[PDB]
Amino acid sequence: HTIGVVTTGLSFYGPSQILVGIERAAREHGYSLLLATVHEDPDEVEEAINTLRERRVDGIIIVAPHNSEPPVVFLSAQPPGVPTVSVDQYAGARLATEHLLDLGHRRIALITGPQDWLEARERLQGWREALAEAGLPPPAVLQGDWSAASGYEAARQLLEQPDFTAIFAANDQMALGVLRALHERGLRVPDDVSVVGFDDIPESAYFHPPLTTVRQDFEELGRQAVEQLLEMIEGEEPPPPAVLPPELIVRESTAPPENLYFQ
Amino acid sequence: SHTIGVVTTGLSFYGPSQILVGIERAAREHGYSLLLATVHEDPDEVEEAINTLRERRVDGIIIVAPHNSEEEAQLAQEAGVPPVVFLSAQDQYAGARLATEHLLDLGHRRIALITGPQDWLEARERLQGWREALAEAGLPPPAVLQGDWSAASGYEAARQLLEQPDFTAIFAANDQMALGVLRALHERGLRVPDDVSVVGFDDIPESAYFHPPLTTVRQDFEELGRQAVEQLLEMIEGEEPPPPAVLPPELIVRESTAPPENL
Structure with missing residues (x-):
């Protein structure tokens, strides 16, 4: 039916x-x-x-x-009384921040979705606690609304105080906006700034450059x-x-x- | 009911x-x-x-x-x-006609077309619209290939078209396919718009945050x-x-x- x-x-x-x-x-x-x-x-x-x-x-x-x-x-x-099928949003945001930490990044900026989202704090916790175990002070956190416009606006705000080498965006669309801001100001991805996203929407493999992201x-x-x-x-x-x-x-x-190698 | x-x-x-x-x-x-x-x-x-x-x-x-x-x-x-x-x-496809007139007025003479699936009557009617518009302007027939609306087929169609790199403009039937077009060109070392002009269709909110920002028909x-x-x-x-x-x-x-x- x-x-x-x-x-x-x-x-x-x-x-x-x-x-x-x-x-x-x-x-x-x-x-x-x-x-x-x-x-x-x-x-x-x-x-x-x-x-x-x-x-x-x-x-x-x-x-x-x-x-x-x-x-x-x-x-x-x-609640455990309610039948659920979900994706570990905490684990995803840890794998992404730990991947950036493993490659040598220390100042990884986070761009989240709306904070009323129930698991948007589960993304924030995965990013904050990953920088905890690494003993690093928290870099900038900015807010988007899952749209590429906010991803672009958040990235040009971070670019006002450019003390970051990586950006973790809470979804791929926002990550697209982040790439746009960096290419506009002439910064190379990933040579100057690495970008990681969330979801593996089919389009993200065809961003410029193909996006590293957490697949749900x-x-x-x-x-x-x-x-x-x-x-x-x-x-x-x-x-x-x-x-x-x-x-x-x-x-x-x-x-x-x-x-x-060649610094 | x-x-x-x-x-x-x-x-x-x-x-x-x-x-x-x-x-x-x-x-x-x-x-x-x-x-x-x-x-x-x-x-x-x-x-x-x-x-x-x-x-x-x-x-x-x-x-x-x-x-x-x-x-x-x-x-x-x-x-x-x-x-x-x-x-x-x-006329019948005024949106596409705007794309055609945009590329012609820029001086483009050899156009590549990435259409939707040609199984539909409208897709074939749209293709004939481009052919008739190009003939009326004194242009050779365009290079034509078929996508499936996904960024993947856009990327794959462009690579096959680039085996005959005589075109200077590409029209993609939707913005997702145009995203794969841009990636394919940037991989081949071609610059957009300097080497190849790209136009899409649908004004998806991500369009302005493609690289480069994508010229497109909004309906x-x-x-x-x-x-x-x-x-x-x-x-x-x-x-x-x-x-x-x-x-x-x-x-x-x-x-x-x-x-x-x-x-």
Whole structure:
């Protein structure tokens, strides 16, 4: 029949790749997708679940962030009573900051998304604590809204006091903006400044230069959400809260801060 | 009931995503929910996408271009159960014509075209539009290759075109493909716009943060979606649609085009 999917705006490409993964596994089981989008209001998520239930939906998947206060499967970390399938956002942000630390970077600036995002502090903690174990004082942290515009605006703000050799952006779109700012001011990536992103949206392998980023397996995430929801539909206990490991994809946007041999 | 079905290209592609944003907003504001019928690789899926929306007793079907020009989309509109509204931007491709006139007025004579999948009638009609426009201007036929709207196919099509590097301008049917075009050229050591001019289509928010910033055709995708909902609702409830406020297509000139280096 139909699966209802609650998501943010389609301008966020990570979540958009989750919709592609949901659709592929749902189509494989004869299920259509019923789309409902929300915008920051926490009661919009609850109201969306109502409307989908009014429309005789067999199951609901919540891609949008919502701290939880037909069967339902959330795609973020919720209480253990709520069925979840999520990606370790803390681990992802550690692998990225530790990768930059391993290459010799010490001043790694962080550009996060909105801080109301439940796991945006889980990204901040992975970055801050990685610099903790390395015994380093925290560099600049700036705010974006998952858009390339804010990534560009955050990077030119960091460029006002250029005391950084790497930028970790909380998603690929913001990272694209970061690259734009650095290429405009004539700084080379990765020779002058390394950039690391989050999500592995298909476009990030074709940025200039190909972006090193933390891959959330959106396709597997959408697959596991449909599989858990389908078992609950056909009568089964909710499978345990599942957490997917993020992978760091190293491409061309990252290098040691200076040349290791010829300085 | 209280559900609108949409035959659409996949959410992986950001042109059709922007259109779906307007559809979902306008349908929710009128009490309807968006049910998805995604066409992936072949226009033969348009018939099956219509019957899948009919199987869920949807009140009305929106068929987004280029799927509306397919024969089984005309038949469903003639059947009228459930009512069917086409979404398209109606010479015939004024947006593309702006790209053509932009490249010609710069002096470009040898154009390379990276189109969408040629299986659709609109894609072949768009290709003929370029051919007729180039012939009327006294230009040789363009070099033509087929993408699949993804940045990968944009990158791969450009590399095959570069095996015959006689062109000075490339038009990419969407901005994602143009992103792969830029990377392929920068790998081959070609400068944009100095060696090769690149133009895209759809004004995706990331366009201004490509390297170089990408000249592109902006179409009012969101309003086109709202207008499709208000027209389908005239067929369902008899509700009078508001006055049409769709802005015409607009070429967004940036930094990706320049006169040909030849002369």
